[PDB]
């Protein structure tokens, strides 16, 4: 007796960076990882989803209907067919997705907002179980589903996401994102190449250690400790990637990073580079406008970001 439900989720940044998935269908992370959901101050940077009763199955991405390259979304929609039967009176549903202002981490947001829609129609479903199905759409969906600072434990067969700190724990902090024009390496290029490194078995253990250290830091809200560690993790991650032919940190990004080391002598900052052509800089809020004003950006564009919460839905219509 309903016909439609809308949902929203926020994009994510890794703080213990994931590389390697169990297989391209289920996409279970091969090791433990960690991340944060982000948006701007108005929450306008976001991914929105609508799932709705239809006569035939349509899938739309940013307004554009898709004919293929949509098997993962379709798979999730089929597995929860009974949820749509019960709430809408039909198994036949269409899906519409729209991204706003996202830098990196958009597929995570898209996956979580699907989960939020499904959870909105059947709220006694276990979000940790639903997350398992969402990973087929994006392997780090849990970061956006649960929001704040999360850890996703994984042995490559089972993975489990837990929220470690609320977005409020980061209210004294900001992230200035520097967005560069370099074409990014696709997610799958990173996953495929990183597992070739003979450093990879150690990397899996180190990622899990970093997650435990982050959880320790969380006990006393040592946010600087967490971002300092994320930067260390960033540098190991990309060191390994460069060794198997994947160079994310391109020339002007290296130049920005060098400059960041200079001003770190003046006031605290720490940076993160995920899979895309962005440099994310954490900074105490009292220095955020200062950092945001630097003129030496080496061609990049600046966005002011903050840590935000998990995915949510509107009332079904």
Is 133 found in the same domain as 4? yes
Is 286 found in the same domain as 243? yes
Beta-bridged to residue 9, according to DSSP, are: 47
Binding residues: 18, 95-99, 104-107, 139, 143, 184, 187
Cα 15 off chain centre by: 10
Beta-bridged to residue 59, according to DSSP, are: 95
Of 136, 124, 129, which is closest to residue 86 (Cα–Cα)? 124
Is 32 found in the same domain as 51? no
Order of all β-strands in the sheet with 4-9: 64-65, 59-61, 93-100, 46-53, 4-9, 312-313
> How buried is 54 (Cβ within 10 angstroms: 0-12 exposed, 13-18 middle, 19+ buried)?
middle
Binding residues for ATP: 95-99, 104-107, 184, 187
**Who contacts 106 (Cβ-Cβ below 8 Å, separation ≥6)?**
11, 47, 99
Start-to-end Cα distance in the chain: 9
Q: What is the resolution of this structure in A?
A: 2.1
**Who contacts 263 (Cβ-Cβ below 8 Å, separation ≥6)?**
269, 291, 294
CA distances from 169 to 42, 106, 162, 308 (A): 18, 23, 16, 10
Method: X-ray
CA angle 130, 134, 137 (to 5 degrees): 170
Q: What are 176's two structure tokens? A: 């200035």
Is 63 found in the same domain as 5? yes
Q: How many CA atoms lie less than 13 Å away from 207 in the CB half-sphere?
A: 29
The residue whose two tokens read 């995915």 is: 311
Is 53 found in the same domain as 24? no
Q: Is 144 within 8 Å of 12 (Cβ atoms)?
A: yes
Is 72 found in the same domain as 26? no
Is 46 found in the same domain as 27? no
**Who contacts 102 (Cβ-Cβ below 8 Å, separation ≥6)?**
11, 45, 46, 47, 109
What is the Cα–Cα distance from 29 to 139, expressed in whole angstroms? 6
Alpha-helix runs per DSSP H in the chain: 71-79, 81-88, 106-121, 127-134, 141-146, 187-194, 200-218, 223-243, 251-264, 288-292
Q: Is 180 within 8 Å of 253 (Cβ atoms)?
A: yes
> How buried is 189 (Cβ within 10 angstroms: 0-12 exposed, 13-18 middle, 19+ buried)?
middle
Is 265 found in the same domain as 119? no
Residue 169 burial (CB count, 10 A):
16
What is the Cα–Cα distance from 9 to 24, expressed in whole angstroms? 23
Q: What are 143's two structure tokens? A: 């970061």
Q: What is the DSSP letter of 215?
A: H
What is the Cα–Cα distance from 87 to 108, expressed in whole angstroms? 25
Q: Which domain holds residue 193?
A: 11-39+148-308
CA distances from 10 to 31, 39, 125, 133 (A): 23, 6, 21, 18
- Give me the number of domains the chain comprises: 2
CA angle 144, 280, 301 (to 5 degrees): 110
The bridge status of strand 59-61 relative to strand 93-100 is: parallel
Q: Torsion angle, CA of 73/78/84/85, rounded to 10 degrees?
A: 160
What is the Cα–Cα distance from 191 to 116, expressed in whole angstroms? 26
Is 5 found in the same domain as 34? no
Residue 70 burial (CB count, 10 A):
18
Is 314 found in the same domain as 250? no
Q: Is 211 within 8 Å of 151 (Cβ atoms)?
A: yes
What is the Cα–Cα distance from 193 to 156, expressed in whole angstroms? 17
Q: Is 234 within 8 Å of 282 (Cβ atoms)?
A: no
Is 274 found in the same domain as 180? yes
What is the Cα–Cα distance from 11 to 45, expressed in whole angstroms? 8
Is 313 found in the same domain as 283? no
Report the length, in residues, of the chain: 317
Binding residues for substrate: 18, 139, 143
């Amino acid at each position: 007796t309903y016909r439609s439900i809308g949902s929203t989720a926020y994009p994510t940044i890794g703080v213990v960076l994931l590389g390697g998935i169990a297989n391209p269908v289920t996409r279970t992370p091969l090791h433990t990882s960690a991340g944060i959901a982000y948006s701007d101050s108005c929450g306008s940077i976001r991914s929105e989803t609508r799932i709705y009763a239809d006569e035939a199955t349509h899938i739309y991405f940013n307004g554009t209907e898709s004919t293929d390259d949509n098997r993962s979304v379709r798979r999730v929609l089929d597995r929860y067919s009974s949820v749509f039967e019960e709430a809408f009176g039909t198994k036949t549903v269409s899906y519409s997705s729209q991204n706003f202002g996202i830098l990196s981490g958009s597929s995570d947001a898209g996956a979580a907002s699907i989960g939020a829609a499904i959870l909105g129609l059947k709220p006694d479903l276990d979000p940790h179980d639903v997350e398992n199905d969402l990973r087929a759409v994006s392997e780090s969906a849990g970061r956006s589903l649960f929001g704040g600072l999360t850890i996703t434990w994984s042995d490559g067969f089972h993975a489990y996401t837990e929220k470690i700190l609320d977005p409020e724990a980061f209210s004294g902090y900001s992230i200035v994102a520097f967005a560069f024009d370099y074409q990014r390496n696709p997610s799958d290029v990173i996953h495929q190449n990183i597992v070739r490194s003979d450093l990879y078995p150690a990397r899996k253990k180190h990622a899990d250690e970093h997650a435990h250290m982050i959880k320790e830091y969380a006990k006393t809200n040592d946010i600087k400790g967490i971002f300092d560690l994320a930067q260390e993790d960033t540098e190991e991650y990309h060191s390994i990637l460069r060794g198997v032919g994947v160079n994310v940190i391109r020339e002007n990004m290296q130049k920005l990073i060098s400059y960041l080391k200079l001003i770190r002598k003046d006031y605290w900052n720490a940076y993160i580079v995920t899979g895309g052509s962005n440099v994310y800089v954490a900074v105490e809020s009292e220095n955020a406008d200062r950092l945001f004003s630097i003129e030496n950006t080496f061609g990049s564009k600046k966005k002011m970001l903050r840590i935000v919460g998990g995915a949510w839905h509107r009332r079904p219509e």
